[PDB]
Ligand binder design. Sequence first.
Ligand SMILES: Cc1cc2nc3c(=O)[nH]c(=O)nc-3n(C[C@H](O)[C@H](O)[C@H](O)COP(=O)(O)OP(=O)(O)OC[C@H]3O[C@@H](n4cnc5c(N)ncnc54)[C@H](O)[C@@H]3O)c2cc1C
Ligand code: PCD
Ligand code: PCD
Ligand code: SF4
Ligand code: FES
Ligand code: FES
Ligand code: FES
Ligand code: FES
Ligand SMILES: [Cl-]
Ligand SMILES: [K+]
Ligand code: NA
Lengths: 48, 760, 48, 48, 323, 157, 157
Amino acid sequence: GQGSNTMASQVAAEVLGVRLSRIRVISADSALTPKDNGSYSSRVTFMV
Amino acid sequence: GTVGVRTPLVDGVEKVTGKAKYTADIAAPDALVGRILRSPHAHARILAIDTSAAEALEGVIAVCTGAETPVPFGVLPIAENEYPLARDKVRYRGDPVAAVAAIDEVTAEKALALIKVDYEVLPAYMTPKAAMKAGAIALHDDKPNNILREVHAEFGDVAAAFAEADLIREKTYTFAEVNHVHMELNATLAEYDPVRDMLTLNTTTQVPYYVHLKVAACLQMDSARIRVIKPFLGGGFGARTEALHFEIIAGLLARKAKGTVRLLQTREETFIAHRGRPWTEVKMKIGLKKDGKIAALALEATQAGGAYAGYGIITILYTGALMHGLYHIPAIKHDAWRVYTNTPPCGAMRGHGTVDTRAAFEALLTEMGEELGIDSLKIRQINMLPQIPYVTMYAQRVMSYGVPECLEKVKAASGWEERKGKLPKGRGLGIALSHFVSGTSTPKHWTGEPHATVNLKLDFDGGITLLTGAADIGQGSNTMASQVAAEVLGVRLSRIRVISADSALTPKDNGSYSSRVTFMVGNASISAAEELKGVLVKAAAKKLDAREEDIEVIDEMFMVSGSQDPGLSFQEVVKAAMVDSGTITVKGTYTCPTEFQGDKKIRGSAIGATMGFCYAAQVVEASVDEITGKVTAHKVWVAVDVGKALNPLAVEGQTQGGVWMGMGQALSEETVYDNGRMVHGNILDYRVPTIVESPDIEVIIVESMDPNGPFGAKEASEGMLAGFLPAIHEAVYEAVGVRATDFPLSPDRITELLDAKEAA
Amino acid sequence: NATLAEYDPVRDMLTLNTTTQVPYYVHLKVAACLQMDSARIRVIKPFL
Amino acid sequence: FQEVVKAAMVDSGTITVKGTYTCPTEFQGDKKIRGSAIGATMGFCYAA
Amino acid sequence: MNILTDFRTHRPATLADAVNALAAEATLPLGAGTDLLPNLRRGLGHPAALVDLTGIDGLATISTLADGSLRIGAGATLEAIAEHDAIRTTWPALAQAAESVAGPTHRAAATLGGNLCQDTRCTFYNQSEWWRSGNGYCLKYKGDKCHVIVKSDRCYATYHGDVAPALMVLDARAEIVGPAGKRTVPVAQLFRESGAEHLTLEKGELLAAIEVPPTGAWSAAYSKVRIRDAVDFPLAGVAAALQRDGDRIAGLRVAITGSNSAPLMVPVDALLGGNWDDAAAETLAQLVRKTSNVLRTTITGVKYRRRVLLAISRKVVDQLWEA
Amino acid sequence: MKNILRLTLNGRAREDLVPDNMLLLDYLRETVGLTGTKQGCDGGECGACTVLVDDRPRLACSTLAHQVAGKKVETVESLATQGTLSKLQAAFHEKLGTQCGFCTPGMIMASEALLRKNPSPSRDEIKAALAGNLCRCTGYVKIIKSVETAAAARLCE
Amino acid sequence: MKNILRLTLNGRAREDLVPDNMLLLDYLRETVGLTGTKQGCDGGECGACTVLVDDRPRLACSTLAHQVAGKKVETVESLATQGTLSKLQAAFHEKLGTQCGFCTPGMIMASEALLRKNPSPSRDEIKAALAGNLCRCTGYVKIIKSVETAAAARLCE
Ligand SMILES: Cc1cc2nc3c(=O)[nH]c(=O)nc-3n(C[C@H](O)[C@H](O)[C@H](O)COP(=O)(O)OP(=O)(O)OC[C@H]3O[C@@H](n4cnc5c(N)ncnc54)[C@H](O)[C@@H]3O)c2cc1C
Ligand code: PCD
Ligand code: PCD
Ligand code: SF4
Ligand code: FES
Ligand code: FES
Ligand code: FES
Ligand code: FES
Ligand SMILES: [Cl-]
Ligand SMILES: [K+]
Ligand code: NA
């Protein structure tokens, strides 16, 4: 609910020079997405 | 080891429990009901259409007409002449004119009845001859004589070749049009998100990439706003190898309604979609030397192709492309005509374009052999390719050829030497050869991309995810891709999870058509697995302080060759490989070399060019009841050269399915039109064989080991279909002495031949 | 709090949808506690 | 962008890339005082 | 959801209640629905109500009576008939005919009453609402023209039921119940040779049972021709019963189906007293040809359908003779 | 109009208000949400909708839901015990009696009816019982093999 | 025991056989399958299950399904027109009156009832109408802004 899918999309779109709408985010499904250590201690915006 | 192991399909558990969700099973509580208003006329101009009363009905959310679909589509870039909803005129009875999205079925039906269309009815043409008459109306303005495509080719000096022959015979054979009858009805679930202007489709397709392209083009919507998913699919057999009108219409309606539309089709409508094998007339002329060697071949093929271009150009080239690559033939002359008719468009059906001319060639070859006093199995052995590799006059490259073994195997298994010519009156045996490509080596769209791409993902948990855009349509491509990757990696098949055919997740694949998947996706999967194995061996070697060259991976264990050390478990190597890396993602690709794509100097030769051919020899035993004229196929012995059977269990099932579909065409299936009206639009009068009259089929696997295929593999699903027709044709001649000239060999045709025989 | 656990006995696989901010930690503890190979477990965090 | 995507597909097909981030060692506390890792971070959010 | 009119479905527990339910307008009897539901789904009929007969206690019993005759309730399934030991042993032609119908799952529920009263068939009729409306419907339903026989004096739809001819050569009787009470007629009389009014049942009447007499010196058989070996309706079907005295035909009954708008008895008295030889078989073929009226209501051609109808009539009699 | 329909479905008591004109197929797929039972044709021609009613096969597309009141109805979803396949299901999977899987629920229900009635069927009895079930993928060969395998497995259990 | 329940739900007529003891929340989520209405507590404390009954808010977890017979019931799934958001839904999305989204369906239904009754509410009236709806993510600030924005946008049109 904090917005990490939006945050990740915003920064990748900025680097690429594309619209936010061009990014589809797939998150938190171990068969498909890279391992993340977790949404704790406010680490996600900084690290992800 | 996983390759060569008889393996139940990796998705079989969901099929036998009813958990597998096909398109019409997908839940979508907000979905509107989509319905298409189809033309009741075989050929007519549309003078006006008023949808005002339908739009005003409570419960009707959207109504569309061709005014909203200004871009046509076609599977071939050079021939896109079909509009999603008709513009200016309709060209077959069933051609879509309008469509509606409503809250429920009864409301959608009422809405269709409220749409007013003013038509100017035009004469319709059911046969190629009627369509080609000078005074016929052109269905399409760019082909005034209704001939979509003509082929006129000569390989070698044909006149001189026929002059060298000792015996020349010619006969004309006719073949009814047939339909795929995949058991699942066509359907599309289209979700349009108006907040984001995005569209997601789940549809009954074998070619999700083509659907993605045509929906983007026809809706004039950027491809980046569309996602295409193929859920479980209830077969297709070629029917679904082109983007179909209902898929595009569902997308159009969802956008117009600003919501979700579920467009289901009836079985009648599935027959109207058609895209099946065209009615074909084949004139076959063969010249032989007295010892049975083929001296020359000349054939003519005329196809009634239905109302829109579709695969037509490709289909007509296939009528002559596979006259090559099976027997050594000194000279070949091929003339063919693909003609538009005011009937549902024909298309690709298992064995695409090669079935009818193969049947005609095999039947005349056998007939001529009889006249020369040469056994039908022997005359084929006499004419096999003399050396391998062999480059055909059509520029195909045959690098593996199991025909000699296929023939010896079926000869022995069927008791041919023992029994041929020694059966009771009313019973007979027949033999035939057939072959098909293991994928067309040139993609339809020139994009310069690899011909297949497979991704693998391996993270800390140790499970390997294999991502492929390939469509498993019941043939087992998800199992095949898993088997070859697991074999390279030395892991159990259970360690691989396959995600397939979802454009937002999986790499694009060109589609499940022309039997290209095992060869191309199989090679790409091996390529990806070798990349992943390289990463893991590097990590193991480091942790074991050994050189990479000395690492061996045996059943999930990384050992040092010769060493005594127990080595590292797969999970220990995964842990080591994650250091300074995290998630591993690799990509494997495969591209057919240019020498396997035909010869640019021979126009259209890309059609028929392939990495390799699956060959099949089959013997059919049948009996004929002279009272009713009924032909009963009792048993088929079929030997198939599939290069290397990756999953022998699936190779057997695929081969039985292919032979059996040929049996349906050979004995009971045929479409029937009456002044444009479809008469066979149900599965009672379109006679798909039941299990009672279907033959037992014994499959013998031949492994020629193709030098370029995955572990030596070639295709295993289309090369055996065509041979059934001429084999049972011969069995009927041995049983009762008549030589059929028209398929199907239904009782009505047999009794006419018997009555003529007796009359004479 | 809630967890939907799908165990497939034909394949000896487990798929979990659960109310977690740490799907990686769940994956590790489910594997350890059930003494089940991590490769046989899939963890998905739906909307939370 | 779409013209560049078409060009990038030539001789490549589907592009997949990976990005990672790791906190430099100096931001992980005193390597010799294990408990000092708790409270060590790349940066702090401050509020008044 | 598959579209059907919004009809009521009555489930009477007795024949009397079923008869009263059938008094209303646009109300049809319903057996297992294997013939009726596919037709209603294609829009052939717009009933206000269906009267399910499958819930009527006692309507599906098969029994033997005092004299050694057979009594079968209209609700008995074709499977039960085909598998009944007494029928297979004493009236094999009836078991043969019942087993030849459709497929095994249809037979697991399809009733004898529904088989006898099944609708006639034509390729202009067994088509969807879209298809028919586009073609202007036809004389049998919602139109005014017959597309097979343009004169359009009547509908020429063909009756393709398999059980009727077998029961006809076995000299069976039909027990009918209705608002006027119970009546019985020779099974052959249940049919009228008219495509669109093919049964002689009146408003509110139901077929309640079939009674087959002891066979005496008669042997009988049924033969069906179809392209596939299951599911298909008969392209032509012939039942025959024979009494043989030495080398002469003492009695003969022949019934055909899949050829006319009703299943019909073929007048064969001319063969009585004679031998069964090539000349007699040709005479029989000509008599069958005369009674038959093979028309193109089928996707399969008339030439073949007529030719095999003649051929199997000779074959079925030759089979009974040689046995 | 809707009326009360009481029956046992996949071992559970059901009591639902169902339209008098609702086909059993639509009741199962739409009212209950059991999508294993399929529709392959426009009425009675393919067997894809085969289910069991009091142990005997029935075409769900050609049966009104109200006609099965008070009866035992079973669909493909009922055969497994939780996630464990029944022997018949395991045989179709292991012997490849199923390829695309679409005709499979109907083919398996018809096979289940056969085996409950005739535990050791001959090849001809298997063909006779599956005569109305169409499959376009297999050529039927391995479907016969699946039923024979299942029959043997059930007998030695 | 089950009894017939007739009502209008999200604009559609329902006629179902429903247990006398079934809570409206369970009827919506399990019988109809509308999962937008949530359960956040063990009974009447949080507002997450708020739905509309004849335009007024009602706690689905504290209402028996049979008590809404013959009434007009609306859940969050009914507010959009096909896929197009209502002005109130668009305001919660655009102003961030929703973060995790769990309290959102109930918060939006309580807001919809308020705007139907009082089209131009003061900040105090907005707080009074949402007083029983708990949110743990927002601190409520942007939820109030969302309702004020929606109210002004509905007054336009
Ligand atoms: C694909 C397919 C193949 C078929 N093949 C064959 C075949 O080979 N041979 C064949 O004979 N049939 C065939 N049929 C037709 C049908 O399945 C069988 O005739 C069958 O016995 C129908 O009986 P039923 O109980 O299902 O009748 P229903 O369908 O319920 O009823 C059929 C008709 O009889 C009326 N009716 C029913 N019971 C009575 C009664 N007791 N008194 C008065 N009227 C009554 C009904 O109102 C209706 O008009 C086939 C059907 C299909 C769909
Ligand atoms: N600079 C910046 C930062 C940030 N951002 C934003 O904001 C957010 C957040 O971020 P961060 O801070 O980084 O965080 P993350 O890590 O992502 O997350 C996590 C957190 O998150 C938060 N918040 C929230 N919200 C909601 N809604 N829910 C929740 O639950 C929560 N939780 C909380 C907590 S407590 Mo712990 O667990 O105790 O440790 S930790 C936590 C993001 O997403 C975005 O949207 C931005 O924009 N910018
Ligand atoms: N060597 C080898 C080969 C193969 N295999 C196997 O077999 C299969 C198949 O393969 P192929 O042959 O390669 O093929 P693909 O490509 O994959 O596929 C496709 C195809 O497929 C087939 N088959 C089938 N099956 C089913 N079941 N369904 C279907 O539908 C079908 N279709 C058909 C057709 S007609 Mo076209 O389209 O006309 O062009 S083409 C086609 C695979 O998967 C596997 O399982 C093996 O093992 N081995
Ligand atoms: S025979 Fe004539 S009237 Fe009867 S159904 Fe056929 S077309 Fe219609
Ligand atoms: S869906 Fe084809 S028989 Fe029922
Ligand atoms: S498995 Fe595909 S139709 Fe039978
Ligand atoms: S769920 Fe908390 S008040 Fe209803
Ligand atoms: S938005 Fe999370 S509880 Fe309100
Ligand atoms: Cl062909
Ligand atoms: K012309
Ligand atoms: Na409207």
